[PDB]
Amino acid sequence: LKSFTVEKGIYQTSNFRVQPTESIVRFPNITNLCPFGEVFNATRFASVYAWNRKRISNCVADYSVLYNSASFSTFKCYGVSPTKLNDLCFTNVYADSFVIRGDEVRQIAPGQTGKIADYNYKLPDDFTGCVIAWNSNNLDSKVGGNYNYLYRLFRKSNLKPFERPLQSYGFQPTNGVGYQPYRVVVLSFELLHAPATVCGPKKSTNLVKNKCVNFNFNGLTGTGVLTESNKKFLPFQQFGRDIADTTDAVRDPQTLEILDITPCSFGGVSVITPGTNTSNQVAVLYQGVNCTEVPVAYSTGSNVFQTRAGCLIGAEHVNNSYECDIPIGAGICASYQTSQSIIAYTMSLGAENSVAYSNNSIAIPTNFTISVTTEILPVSMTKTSVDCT
Amino acid sequence: MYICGDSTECSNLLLQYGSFCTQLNRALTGIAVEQDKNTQEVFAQVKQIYKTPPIKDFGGFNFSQILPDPSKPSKRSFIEDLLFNKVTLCAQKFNGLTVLPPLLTDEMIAQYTSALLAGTITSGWTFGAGAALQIPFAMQMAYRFNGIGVTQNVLYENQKLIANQFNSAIGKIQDSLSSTASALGKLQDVVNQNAQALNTLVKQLSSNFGAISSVLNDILSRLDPPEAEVQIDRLITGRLQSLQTYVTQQLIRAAEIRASANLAATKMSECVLGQSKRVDFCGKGYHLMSFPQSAPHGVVFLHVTYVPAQEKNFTTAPAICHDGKAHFPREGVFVSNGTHWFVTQRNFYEPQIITTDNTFVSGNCDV
Amino acid sequence: RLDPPEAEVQIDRLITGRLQSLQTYVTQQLIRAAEIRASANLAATKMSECVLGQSKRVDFCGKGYHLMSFPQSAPHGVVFLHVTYVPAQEKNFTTAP
Amino acid sequence: MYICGDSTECSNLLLQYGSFCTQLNRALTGIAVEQDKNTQEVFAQVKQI
Amino acid sequence: AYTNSFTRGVYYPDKVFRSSVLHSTQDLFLPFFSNVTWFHAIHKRFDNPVLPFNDGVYFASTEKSNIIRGWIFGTTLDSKTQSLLIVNNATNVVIKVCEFQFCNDPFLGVYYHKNNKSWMESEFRVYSSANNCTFEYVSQPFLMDLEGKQGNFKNLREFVFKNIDGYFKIYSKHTPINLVRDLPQGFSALEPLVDLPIGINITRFQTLLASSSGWTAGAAAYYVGYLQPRTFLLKYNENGTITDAVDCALDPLSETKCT
Ligand SMILES: *[C@@H]1O[C@H](CO)[C@@H](O[C@@H]2O[C@H](CO)[C@@H](O[C@@H]3O[C@H](CO[C@H]4O[C@H](CO)[C@@H](O)[C@H](O)[C@@H]4O)[C@@H](O)[C@H](O)[C@@H]3O)[C@H](O)[C@H]2NC(C)=O)[C@H](O)[C@H]1NC(C)=O
C-alpha cells in the first residue's frame, strides 16, 4: 500500500501456490529395434572388398538396447551423444559391416592417414558416422588364419565418396595387442535428406501418487497430483480432455490403468487486521485453500479454522453473533476485541423482532421526531486533454 | 498464471511491459465489490429481523407456498425451490481462473426475503418508514383500494370472492412456472453469457498467434533464448490482447448489470414498501402491492393488480341544473341510461342518488 | 545508441506500447464518464423532485417521510440535506373494521 | 471483407488469431437486436389497433 | 450402380477420450449420402480394375471366405517404384513394400466351386516378380472374423485407407447386421487398425481376388468411395465411442446444426 500506516480492514496480498514436490518420468519400455543389433553384434560380417552398405529406415533407432553393451571403450559422437538419442528421430541410417585388420579401425575414421585405407573403404569428406572400436577377435578368428578378407583392391583411378594392409597371413588370435582383427561398426546417418521415418527410444522411472509432482508421460510434461481414477478409457485412447479441450486423465503406458490429473492447490492470500496504532496482530487468509498444506511456507499456526472460502490462520474463532466488521466470506466476519486479539464469528444479520400480530390491535404513534440526513453525489470530474504527439 | 504461468521467462518478460496486471487486478476487484454491494442494497434494506407468527389467519388469504416451510433444510419458498430446480447449467481452475463465493449465502437472502414479506403482511407499509406497526390485512387492502381511488366497502362486500380469485391466480402462476421454463430466459442468458465468455477465453490459449506453436514449454525446449523470445513475446502479445478484450466486455456487462440492479432496488423500495402511482411500473394494471422472491443472482416480483373486466355504458352530462344553478360532482361522474340520472365513482359502476352533499354549486346554467 | 535502421524496431515497440496504453486510458476515461453522467442525471432528477417539490416516492429523498431538502455545492459534486418526518413513540389500541 | 477481403491466404493466416471477429459479430448482432427491442418496447405498448 | 451411402465411412480420427463431448473435426471424410461406385465381382468377365487412389479410399464389402484377399497400392505397380502388397489371410498379413514386378493376374486364385468343384489352389501369382525389395512386414498371427461363415451377413469389412505425409493408416470395423440386401442404414465407427510410417505415395490401387466363360456370374458386391475434405460434428458418447455424426456441407439443416 506504499504507506507506513494502514487502515483497519482486509487487503489482498501476494497469491500462494503449492510448489512441486518432485519429478516423475513414466514411459513405455524398449520398443521395436532398428537393424542395429546385427550391425554391432553378429557372427559374421561382410567382406572387406564387399564392404556392406545397409539402408535402415522405418524402425526405431533404440540407443538403449545398443548402449547397454559394456564392451565399448569410448563410444561418443563428436556432435551428439547416445544418451540424448531418446528424443532424436532419424531419416535413414547406413550400416557399414566389414572385417579388416585391427590397426585399420582408425583408418576407417574420417580424416585419417594412409594409402591403404581408401583402397578398400574410401574416406568421404562429410562422414558423420561415429567411429566405434570394439573387440571382435574371437568372431573374426580362425584356427589357421583367414586370408579370404584380403585387400587386393589396388585400383589406380581416384576413388569418389562412397562410389560402391596384408601384413598378417590370416586373422588369428595369436595377433598381438592392437593387431587382432576388429569389426569396424559405424552408424553413418544423415538428417534433412530423407523423410523422417526413424525415431528414438524412451526411459521411465518409478510411480508416485498424491503429490504435486512434475509428471512426464509419453512426452506429455506437466505438473500435478496423480490419483487412481475409475474412468474407463478405450483400449487405444491413452488420455482424455475436458470440455475445455484440456488433458484431465492419462493412462499409464507401462501398466494398463487410468489416472487423474489434479493441479496442486493454490489461491490468493490476504491479511486482516485493525488499525496500525490499534494493534500489531494480524490474520492471514488463503482463499480457496485448505489448512492441509498451509505449513508449506507462520508455518506453525496454532490457531486454524476451516471455512468454505478457505482456511484461516492466526485468528480465534467465536461462536457468537455480531454485525459484520471485516467481511471474510460465506457469512463469516472478523472483529478485534479482548488480552486484545483478533476474532472471527458468524455475522449477525440483525436483532430478531416479532410483531405482536393480532389483526385487532393498532399501534398509533403518540409523537414524532424530525430528522436531517446528508446525501452526497458526484456531478462531474476535472476535464482533461492531451497532445498525442 | 493464465498467460504464461510457471516460467521465470514469463515473469521477467511480463515485467518488461509494466503494470497491466496491476491495473486489471483492481479492474476486476471493483466489479466483485460492486456485485457484493448491489446485493447489499437490493436485499439488506431492513434494520431488524422479523418472523411470521404461527397463526396464519390472514382473512382467508393463503400465504403459504411463498412462505417458508420449516421442514425443508433450506427455508425457501415452494416457488423459490421450484425456480432453483428449473435453473440449471468447474474445470476452468487450471489457469488461475478463480470464482469468489458471494459474501452472503442463499440462506441469508432467504431469511431477508422472509423478514421482508412478514413485515409487509404484518404492518402494511409502516415498517419501511420505521418501526413496524401491526395492522389487519383487511384494513391494509381497504387502504390500497383507497389508494387506487376505490371505496373500501366493496372490499368487504366481496372479501371471499377476492380471496378466492387471489388463491386461483397464485395457484395458476405456480402451475405456469412449473410447466414452462422460458420465463427464466433472462437469468439463463446471463449465466450462459458468463460461461461462454470464460470458455472462449480459455480457448484462446491454444492459438499460436503467428508463433510456431502455442505450447510455451515446447518453445522453451526446442529453442534458445533469442528465438524463444521472438516467439514468446508474440504469444504474450496475443494472450494479452485476448485478456483485455475479456476484461472490457466484463466491464460493460457489469455496468449494465449495475443499472439493472439500481432499477430493481427502486422497484423494491417503491412497489413493495409502498403503493406507488407510476403507470405500469409495478406491472400492468392498477398496482396494489408486490411480493419478492430470491433466485440465483436474480429476483422475482409478483405484481398484484386490479383490472376492470365487464362494462355497461350509459349517457352522460357535463353537469346538472336544478334551480338555474350549475351543480357538479365532487368526485366520480354523472351517468344516465335514460330513465334516471345518478353519480358514481369513476372506476366502478356504483350508481347513487344525486343530492346536495354529493355535488357542489358553481355559477349559473347558461355559461 | 542505435543506427536509425535497427532503432526503428525499438521505436515501433515503444510507439505501440504508448499508444495502446493511451487508448486503454481513453476507454477507462469514457466508461468513468458514462457512469458519472448516469449519476449526474439521477442527481438532477433528485434535485428537481425533492428541492423544487415534495415527492411521494418511498425513501427517494432520504429515509422517512420527505418534507423538503436543500442543496450544497461540493467540489465536482453536490450535497443534499433531506428533512424528514418520522414517528417516535407508539401506543396501540383496539380497532374494528 | 474488411480484414482479409477476398484472400484465401489472408484468411488462413487470420485463422491463427482465434475468433475475435466472431465475438465482434455476436456483439453487433446483439446491438441490432437491441435496437429492434427498444423500438418494440417504446412503441408497441398497445395490442389493439 | 451409382449407389448412395447413408451414414458409413466414419472412423475414429484420434486417440482422444472424450466423454459426452460433441466435437467438430475438419478432415478427409466420405460425404453423407455421397454417390459411391458399386462393383459386382464377376467370376471371362472379371471386375478387377485398377482404380485411382484419390487421396483416401473407402472400401466396403460383406463378402465371406476372404474372396478378396488383399490390396495392391502404388504409383507405378511395375517395380519401378516400391509398391505395397497387403495380401492377407486368417493368421496374419505379409505386408510387403517393395519394388515388385506385378503380373496381369497377381493373386493366388483359388477358383473353387467354379470349374468342377473338388478342391485346389490354382496359381501362386501372389509372387509375380521383383526388381528389388525395400521392406516387408508380417503382422501378428491374428484370427479375424473374415473367413467363410455366412449365416446372416455380419462381416461388414469397411476399410478406410489414408496416406498422409508418408504415414499410411488403415481403419476398419466388423459391423454385424441382418439385412442381406444392399448396405442397410446404421451408424458404426471404424476404429484404426494399422498405422505404417511407410513414406511412399499411392496414385493407383488394385484389388486382389481369390477366362471362366460359361461359369455362373459371381455373387459378391463391394463399394468404392472417395473421401473429401469436409467438416463433421461427431458425438462422443459418455464412453468416448462415436454414436452420431453430422456434415455441414450436406444441406442447410446440417450446416446450421454444426454451426
Ligand atoms: C395454501 O395452499 C397450500 C397448498 O399446498 C396449502 O398447503 C396444503 O398442501 C397440500 C398439498 O401438499 C394440500 O393437500 C394436502 O395434501 C396432503 C398430502 O398430499 C397428498 O396426500 C394426501 C393423503 O395423505 C391427499 O389427501 C392429498 O390430496 C394429496 O394427494 C394431505 O395430507 C392433506 O390432507 C391435503 O389434502 C392442502 O389442501 C393444502 N392445505 C390448504 C389449507 O390449502 C396451505 O395450507 C394453504 N394455506 C392456507 C392458510 O390455507
Ligand SMILES: *[C@@H]1O[C@H](CO)[C@@H](O[C@@H]2O[C@H](CO)[C@@H](O[C@@H]3O[C@H](CO[C@H]4O[C@H](CO)[C@@H](O)[C@H](O)[C@@H]4O)[C@@H](O)[C@H](O)[C@@H]3O)[C@H](O)[C@H]2NC(C)=O)[C@H](O)[C@H]1NC(C)=O
Ligand atoms: C339503467 O336502467 C335500469 C333500469 O332498472 C336502472 O335501474 C335502476 O334501479 C333502481 C332501483 O333498483 C331505480 O330506482 C327505482 O327503481 C324502482 C324499480 O326499479 C326499476 O323499475 C322502475 C320501474 O318500475 C324504474 O323506474 C327504475 O328506474 C328501475 O328500472 C322504481 O319503481 C323507482 O321509481 C325508481 O326508479 C333506478 O331509477 C334505476 N335507474 C334508471 C336510470 O333507470 C339503472 O340505474 C340504469 N343504469 C344507469 C347508469 O343509469
Ligand SMILES: *[C@@H]1O[C@H](CO)[C@@H](O[C@@H]2O[C@H](CO)[C@@H](O[C@@H]3O[C@H](CO)[C@@H](O)[C@H](O)[C@@H]3O)[C@H](O)[C@H]2NC(C)=O)[C@H](O[C@@H]2O[C@@H](C)[C@@H](O)[C@@H](O)[C@@H]2O)[C@H]1NC(C)=O
Ligand atoms: C520395461 O521394464 C521392465 C523390463 O523387464 C518390464 O516391466 C515389468 O516387468 C515385470 C516382470 O517381468 C512384468 O510383470 C509381469 O507382467 C505380465 C503382464 O501380462 C504378467 O502377466 C506377469 O504375471 C508379470 O506380472 C511386467 O510386464 C512389467 N510391468 C511394467 C509396469 O513395466 C517391462 O519389460 C517388458 O517385458 C515384456 C513383458 C514386454 O512387456 C516387453 O514389451 C517389455 O520389454 C517393461 N515395462 C512395460 C512395457 O511396461
Ligand SMILES: *[C@@H]1O[C@H](CO)[C@@H](O[C@@H]2O[C@H](CO)[C@@H](O[C@@H]3O[C@H](CO)[C@@H](O)[C@H](O)[C@@H]3O)[C@H](O)[C@H]2NC(C)=O)[C@H](O)[C@H]1NC(C)=O
Ligand atoms: C461405456 O459404458 C457404457 C455403460 O457404462 C456401455 O454401455 C453399456 O451400458 C450398461 C449400463 O451401464 C452396462 O451395464 C450392462 O452390461 C451388460 C453386459 O456386461 C449388458 O448385458 C447390460 O445390458 C448393460 O449394458 C454395460 O456394461 C455397458 N456395456 C455393455 C457391452 O453392455 C458402453 O458400451 C461403454 N462404451 C464402450 C465399451 O465402448
Ligand SMILES: *[C@@H]1O[C@H](CO)[C@@H](O[C@@H]2O[C@H](CO)[C@@H](O)[C@H](O)[C@H]2NC(C)=O)[C@H](O)[C@H]1NC(C)=O
Ligand atoms: C481440508 O482437508 C481435510 C482432510 O485433509 C478435509 O477433511 C476430510 O478428510 C478426509 C480424509 O479421509 C477426506 O476423506 C474428506 O474428503 C475430507 N473432506 C473434504 C471436504 O475435503 C477438510 O474437509 C478439508 N477442508 C476444506 C476443503 O475446506
Ligand SMILES: *[C@@H]1O[C@H](CO)[C@@H](O[C@@H]2O[C@H](CO)[C@@H](O)[C@H](O)[C@H]2NC(C)=O)[C@H](O)[C@H]1NC(C)=O
Ligand atoms: C354503448 O355505446 C354504443 C355506441 O353506439 C351504443 O350503441 C352500440 O354501438 C356499437 C357500435 O358503435 C354497436 O356495436 C352496438 O351494437 C350498439 N348497441 C346499441 C344498443 O345501440 C350502445 O347503445 C351504448 N349502450 C348504452 C348507453 O347502454
Ligand SMILES: *[C@@H]1O[C@H](CO)[C@@H](O[C@@H]2O[C@H](CO)[C@@H](O)[C@H](O)[C@H]2NC(C)=O)[C@H](O)[C@H]1NC(C)=O
Ligand atoms: C398492544 O396492546 C397489547 C395489550 O395486551 C400489548 O401487546 C404487547 O406488545 C408487545 C410488543 O412490543 C409485546 O412485547 C407484549 O408481549 C405484548 N403484551 C400483550 C399482553 O399482548 C401492548 O399493550 C401493546 N403492544 C405494544 C405497545 O407494542
Ligand SMILES: *[C@@H]1O[C@H](CO)[C@@H](O[C@@H]2O[C@H](CO)[C@@H](O)[C@H](O)[C@H]2NC(C)=O)[C@H](O)[C@H]1NC(C)=O
Ligand atoms: C496365413 O498367412 C500367413 C502369412 O502371413 C501364412 O504363413 C505361411 O507360413 C509358412 C511357414 O512360415 C510359409 O512357408 C508360407 O509361405 C506362409 N504362407 C503364405 C505366405 O501364403 C499362413 O500359412 C496362412 N494360413 C492360412 C490358413 O492361410
Ligand SMILES: *[C@@H]1O[C@H](CO)[C@@H](O)[C@H](O)[C@H]1NC(C)=O
Ligand atoms: C489511530 O489514529 C490516531 C493516531 O495513531 C490515534 O490517536 C487513534 O487512537 C487511532 N484511531 C482511533 C479511531 O482511535
Ligand SMILES: *[C@@H]1O[C@H](CO)[C@@H](O)[C@H](O)[C@H]1NC(C)=O
Ligand atoms: C461454540 O459452541 C459450539 C457448541 O457448544 C461448539 O461446538 C463450538 O466449539 C463453540 N465455538 C467457540 C469459538 O466457542
Ligand SMILES: *[C@@H]1O[C@H](CO)[C@@H](O)[C@H](O)[C@H]1NC(C)=O
Ligand atoms: C448419385 O445418386 C443420386 C441420386 O440418384 C444422383 O442425384 C446423383 O446424380 C448420382 N451421382 C452421379 C450420377 O454422379
Ligand SMILES: *[C@@H]1O[C@H](CO)[C@@H](O)[C@H](O)[C@H]1NC(C)=O
Ligand atoms: C462342373 O461339373 C458339374 C456337372 O454337373 C456342373 O454342375 C458345373 O457346371 C461344373 N462346375 C462346378 C461344379 O463348379
Ligand SMILES: *[C@@H]1O[C@H](CO)[C@@H](O)[C@H](O)[C@H]1NC(C)=O
Ligand atoms: C535392388 O537392387 C538394385 C541393384 O541391383 C538397386 O538399384 C535397387 O535400389 C535395389 N532396391 C530397390 C527398391 O530397387
